Amino acid sequence: MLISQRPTLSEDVLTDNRSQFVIEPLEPGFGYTLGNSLRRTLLSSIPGAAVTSIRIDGVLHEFTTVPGVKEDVTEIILNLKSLVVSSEEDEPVTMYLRKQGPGEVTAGDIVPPAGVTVHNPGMHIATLNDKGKLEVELVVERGRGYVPAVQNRASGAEIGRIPVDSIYSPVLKVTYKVDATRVEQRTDFDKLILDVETKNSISPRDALASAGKTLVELFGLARELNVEAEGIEIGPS
Amino acid sequence: MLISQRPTLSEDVLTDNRSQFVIEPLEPGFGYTLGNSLRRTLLSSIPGAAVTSIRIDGVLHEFTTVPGVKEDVTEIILNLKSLVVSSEEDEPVTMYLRKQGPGEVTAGDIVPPAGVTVHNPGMHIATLNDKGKLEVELVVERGRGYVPAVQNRASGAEIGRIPVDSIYSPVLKVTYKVDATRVEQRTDFDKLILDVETKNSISPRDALASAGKTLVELFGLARELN
Amino acid sequence: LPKLMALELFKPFVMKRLVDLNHAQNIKSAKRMVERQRPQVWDVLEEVIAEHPVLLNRAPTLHRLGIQAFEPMLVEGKAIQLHPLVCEAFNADFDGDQMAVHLPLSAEAQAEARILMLSSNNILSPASGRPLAMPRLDMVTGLYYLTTEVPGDTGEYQPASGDHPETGVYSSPAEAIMAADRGVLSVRAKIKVRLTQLRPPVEIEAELFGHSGWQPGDAWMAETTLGRVMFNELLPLGYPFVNKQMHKKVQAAIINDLAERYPMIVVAQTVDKLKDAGFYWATRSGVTVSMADVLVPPRKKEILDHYEERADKVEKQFQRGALNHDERNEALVEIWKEATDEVGQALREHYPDDNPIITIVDSGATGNFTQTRTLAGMKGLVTNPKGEFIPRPVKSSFREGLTVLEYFINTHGARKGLADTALRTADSGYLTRRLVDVSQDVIVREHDCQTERGIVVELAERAPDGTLIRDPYIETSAYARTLGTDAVDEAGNVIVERGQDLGDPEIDALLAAGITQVKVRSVLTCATSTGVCATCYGRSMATGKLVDIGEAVGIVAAQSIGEPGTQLTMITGGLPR
Amino acid sequence: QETTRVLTDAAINCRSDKLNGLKENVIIGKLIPAGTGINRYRNIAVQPTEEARAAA
Amino acid sequence: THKRRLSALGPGGLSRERAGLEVRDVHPSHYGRMCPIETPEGPNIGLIGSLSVYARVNPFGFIETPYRKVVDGVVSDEIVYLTADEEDRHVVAQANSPIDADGRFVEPRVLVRRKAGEVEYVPSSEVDYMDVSPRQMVSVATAMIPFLEHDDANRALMGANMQRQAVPLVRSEAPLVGTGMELRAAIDAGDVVVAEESGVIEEVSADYITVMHDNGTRRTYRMRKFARSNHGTCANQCPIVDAGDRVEAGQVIADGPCTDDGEMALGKNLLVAIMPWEGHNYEDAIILSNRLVEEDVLTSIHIEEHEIDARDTKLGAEEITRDIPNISDEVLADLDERGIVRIGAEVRDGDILVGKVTPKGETELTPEERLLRAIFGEKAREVRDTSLKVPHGESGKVIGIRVFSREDEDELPAGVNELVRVYVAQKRKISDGDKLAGRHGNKGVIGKILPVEDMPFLADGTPVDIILNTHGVPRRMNIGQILETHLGWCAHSGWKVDAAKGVPDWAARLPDELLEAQPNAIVSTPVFDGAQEAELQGLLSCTLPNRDGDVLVDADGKAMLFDGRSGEPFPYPVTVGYMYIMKLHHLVDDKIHARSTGPYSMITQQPLGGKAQFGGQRFGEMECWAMQAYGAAYTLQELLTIKSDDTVGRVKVYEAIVKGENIPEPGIPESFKVLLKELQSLCLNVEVL
Amino acid sequence: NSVPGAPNRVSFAKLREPLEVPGLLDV
Amino acid sequence: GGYDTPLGITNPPIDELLDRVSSKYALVIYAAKRARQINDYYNQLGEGILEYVGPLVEPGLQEKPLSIALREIHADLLEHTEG
Ligand SMILES: [Mg+2]
Ligand SMILES: [Zn+2]
To answer: Burial of C149 by CB count in 10 Å (0-12 exposed, 13-18 middle, 19+ buried)?
Structure first.
């Protein structure tokens, strides 16, 4: 059996990291059969590093205030979460961010240890009014998907480190929709249209091929049941 | 933590032509989609065989009746739309059927040439009496999906030949379900248990392998190819 | 458009266009090839259909939105696939209706089909100004469920400071969607997202930014649901945030606002996005109907027994000789009306606010409460063939199953209503016909007759302690008019000068000034010999701006009065009046 | 209605018609004088500007 | 139901426009004689009705009805046919009254129908008559709707009128849940070959059957196969007995068009859900599964009849022959040596069916044509090529060919030497645009047909067949179509009341031997005496598992469907069941029309069509009003001048189009230089200034 | 019921039918 | 401002067209006459040259003259004068 055609992946470059790929022409109905799978894999199948839990000096019991900073304690958290970062030593690897005197703290104000790095130093994190120094201790680790705030196994037995929701996936948003190209010459085929916004940790083209890989190594499990089979074939590129 | 291991697909056989396939572990929210994507291919892209057109001697067209038989021609056509045949070679090989005297012409009474075979010899095609004589030659072919009756005028066939609908689909019923443990301490996984039942033409293992091949040979065009 | 019908309509055009490309020796061979349906033609037909608008029409054609131009595109099958939003303007339903398709030929014809009669240029009705492409039955309950708020749902705004952080705030809609794909967050649960691409409401932005609180790249944490973020993703970028559960009236208001403040090419795209979201969420809405969801009032029998005692005492009084026939008949009618209303109120009290049969109505999607009251509860009183009520009355409800006599009595009104609907729909045509025959010479002639005479309107008659409450019917009397004489408050100075359109802002300013009489120019005093002038006629209702100098504004005003005639029910009450 | 007695008197008075309404034109088949039939509209002169025509 | 009809209009009676809305209204005397539900929807409501079931016609022409006379509160069995006159004078009881094993009205009072027509209430002493059973008011076509007492009169009327329009399918499967009027209305319809005298089968064949009566002489029945009906359907017929079966007088022997095992079966049972699916079933639209197309579950047959005649003309006699004027040789590869086509030829649109030719006469050809015949050495002929060609959009095999000839004693009309007819058959599948409908008046066209793999499938893997919308159920007051959806599932799964210690309160009454039913079991529910709202709910908590013990439909009657397209399950349980739907005869192949340029009437030059002629659409008046309201003068004039009458305009625009030039601006039509002449014929001097 | 070889269609009815349907085509 | 990319018949937008004309009828006749001119242009190219000019804008592969006329009008490449 032969597909009697070949779908072509024709990329398209929107703003620096907002590519929009299209695949055509798929035989009906394969748009949905692989669109949702691509979406889910891109979303929750790529490794990546993110912050897990932090601790702010002077918040032990007072849980919404910080001396000398405009932002409260319930805003710094959702201000850090969106801090793109990459790591390679898979283990809790704490970092420290401190700064004194009146001024605006930024991503580049923190000194990452060996193995971890930051990809957006110009990010606004907080502003110290005057004559007040802030010190924070973060924990960075790897993973996949989106793990909500992992309530540690202390529920009080901890020094007061706030656990924050983690965003491991390098991509941030994915959508798709199919069409009906060439209903007479192609006899009602499909035209998949992806749209992937990617965090600036990796391009939106090196974060799809990896999904294709991790998916071809998962659908193979089945295909490695009777090698001498007969499916639909595409052929050479 | 990026819990690191590999999903392993194992098979539990329930009956002759049905079986379950357990795949685990998978990332949360990934079981349903994977099961659906396997089912959506199993039901549409499995290659099989099926009779395309048939010709009977005493009948010119399809809206007539043969002398002696009980059912008219279009009833024999319908009864012949359930034949489960598995052609091996890729070409329009023909099969013959000839019966005389009173009795029942059951699908298991067809002489299949070398390469093809009938997998339900208990099917009932038609019934004859002392004055009944039924001779019909069928054309088996290859293909996938479902192709409507190829118009006779489209091809250069004689008046006798009669087109018929073809249903190439070895698979009969596919379902699934997940068991998402997702114990709430941030170490979770899924467990997809597909369940496949075929029409005695090809075992479930072969159906699932062909589905896996069709999905792998088409997800690769989004692989490092780009 | 079915490829067969397209190939029949465009036979000459394709016959020509397949001669340049030498697919036929001459026009005769081309005609023969087309009548034989050779494979070559299907390639040419797609090249000739491109950008060739066709006029679709449905009979009867009551108002000027019954004939609309469309950009066709070939389609397999034998059905004229119509867009779901133009089903209201046409009044067509898909239970077996049929539409006619015509083709324009000349260049002027195609220009008119592309400019005047196009589908996406007529959103607002020419009679009232409201929109007609607004969502309806399915898209309405879709958006209603996409934007409704549910207290206590999953992932709700927890904040329980004292032992941990809030645990209900998100970085941005992206993280919210990521957590909603999992089971963590529900789409209808109050949260606190941080938006950076939706302009905050006037109230917030006023203080948060003040100078210019634009929303291209500046964040503003807002506490809402996730559904409303996904909804406001649909509306334009500049349009402010809404944060309100989207009933049908709210959607009407929003679409009318977009139709006023924004161009015409944005409203159509917004409506398409809204229909898409509405369908997609209506499917996930879980709105089914099972006889286990048609609840019956819990204590109907007690009310029925009370009113039974009442009616039996009345009938016994009659039998005794106290009141004549008609007296007892009317007393029984009154008693049973009271019983019907009290059982309806009990039913409405019993139903939960999320019951499917009751949510399909609450969201203005379709139907009304009375129907539900007749499904579960009591049917009420059944009219006679002549028109008088029956003193029985019908007690059971269509969910308990009526008896034989009740059904036989109901058939009376059931058939009478059908006959009357037939007669009324047939007789509204004559009224429309006379209206059009009397007012065909009224067409805009000059830009301004430059007269001074003019009528006056109320505009929120003053009040004792209300100082000024809007007149109820102001949107149909003082909108889309042009002031004739400069309007001023107490001596003060000018508040609004002659020659304004009296829109929303000018109306608000005038009402603030506290004036309850504004002299407005009207076609009742136009000074042109034959026809009226654009300034006297006021603003057009379809375009939203001043009328043109060629509009046949007589037939429009006749059709607007004659079209809704089919809704006229009932000294005479209804259409005869 | 009663076209006979509507014509037998117009002819006497030698009366004339102005074709001013939009039902006389539809009766005699002439182009209706409303919308895109007005003279100001259906007598437009359309020719490229000299600047653009220079490029050709 | 075409018989048993009574039309107040026609000769010797009133008319349709000169009869006020008083003979239309239902009279309280119609109870038992004329059905109030069944009646047309057009401008005939009340003028054309249908007889009841139990009614009977007096010797004079007055309609009677049977009652049971009760004497002293003791309901007897003395049936007495009362007319309409002597019914009011008496007092009629109610059909469903608590009689206790003898004919005694258990309760002290009873409902009645007194003379005037009111619905009074009386003691159990004056009651002298009582109906024989409920559904007396209901006609035959209406007595087949399950749960009629739950539907509104409008929807019940539409359902009763949408059953005589169904089409006979190829399999003709019986309905899973109907009423008692199925089996007793097919054997009387006259299309079920009923064994005459109790005998024993001797020989059966698709063509005929033979029964050997117990007394010598046998009898052979001849069933009609593939006979065309009057409306184009198929009149097939097939035996339902073997060569040994014993039969008794009255038993059914051969099924009919829409029958199955000798009882009415107008449609098929389909698994239906009640959710709105992504906007494809919007406002009465319906979506189907491909299974209904693959497995020939709604395939129907249609047989059309074309006819031509060869007469004698002024120049001679028309001849039906294979020879033809200038024509190819590939348009004759299916005609027999003597013209008419051969049985079995797969014809299509435009092909030739009968080879006809008529004398041309005599003319004179211009140079360009004479210099062309000489080149191609084909001297002209004196015959016209007027054959019988298949109309537009029609195909399918050729079944039968009938031929009559004056020369062969085959009498025919005046001046007709030959007359031929050709029957063309066609198997039509279900296709978007074909109207469907249930028993309860709900209808809709088919808008989308999803592949079998993307359709909400139950937890087992079984895809729903049709997907009805919800917003149509409430506001139309036809919740009946929901109850049968619930029951339809029960009778499909099969139940077993758990009363193995004591019959539960809810089901301690209805029948015996109905506390359990094998899966896929048939049931019935008379019109006004059937299941009860409190019984289904009791029959819905026992829905034995399909294969592995797993109840799919919870107590409320709702499953948990998986979205076949997105993969994940829907968040709320959906209602699913088995509904019995029928394919109506309003297919798109009949409606779809078009016309680029056809024939025009001779007297009035407006377009005109017929059997094989397009016909041309009618641009009415209100359409002109709308056009004017738009201000589009050119489009209106074009629709009025160069598309209806202006002969010098139609050709002058067609030439421009075909040559690719500009369409000439519409000037003043030529239908204005004729008004001036028609005036000047009256001595009226009209001048254009 | 009252037909030699009719199928067995269970009924939900509760009452009797003293009179059986007439010869529908009698009219 | 910024709304979206129009598709087919809806391009170019009318809101950006009604500024080149007083009302919609004038624009209708404008486009009709420009399209008639363009179509005459295409015919007469065979024999001796003529004075008809256009299309001023480079057309597409197979594009109707009315759309070319509308694209030219939207670009401000030709003026008119009402009656
Ligand atoms: Mg309708
Ligand atoms: Zn004026």
So the answer is: middle
